[PDB]
Amino acid sequence: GSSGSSGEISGFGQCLVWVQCSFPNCGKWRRLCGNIDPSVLPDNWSCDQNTDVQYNRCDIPEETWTGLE
Ligand SMILES: [Zn+2]
Numbered sequence: 001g002s003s004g005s006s007g008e009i010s011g012f013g014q015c016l017v018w019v020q021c022s023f024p025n026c027g028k029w030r031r032l033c034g035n036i037d038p039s040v041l042p043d044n045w046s047c048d049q050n051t052d053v054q055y056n057r058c059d060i061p062e063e064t065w066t067g068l069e
Contacts, residue, residue, distance in 0.1 A: 021058060022046050028062045030055050 006013065017036055018029040022044045030050040042049070050056035055063070 019045055019050075023058060026058050028055075028058075028060075031063065 005011075015034050017032050017034060017038070019032060019036075019038060019041060020029050021027060023046060026047060028047065030047050031052055033051045036051070047056060047058045047060065054060070
C-alpha cells in the first residue's frame, strides 16, 4: 500500500470521479475523464452518458477489483 501524498511536485496528482448509473439493474459506477462533477451532472445520468467508450454502455461490466498481493 501507499499513501497518496498531496503536495509533492513529483508524481501524478490528477483527481478521480465516479458516477453511478440511474437504472437499478445497472447501479454500476462508471469512470469519467476527471473534470466532471455530480453536482453539475444530471439526475437521470446513465452509462450511455459516459466519456470512456470502454464503459459507456449499460451492458459493460464494472471495473474488476485490482490489487497486487
Ligand atoms: Zn447503466
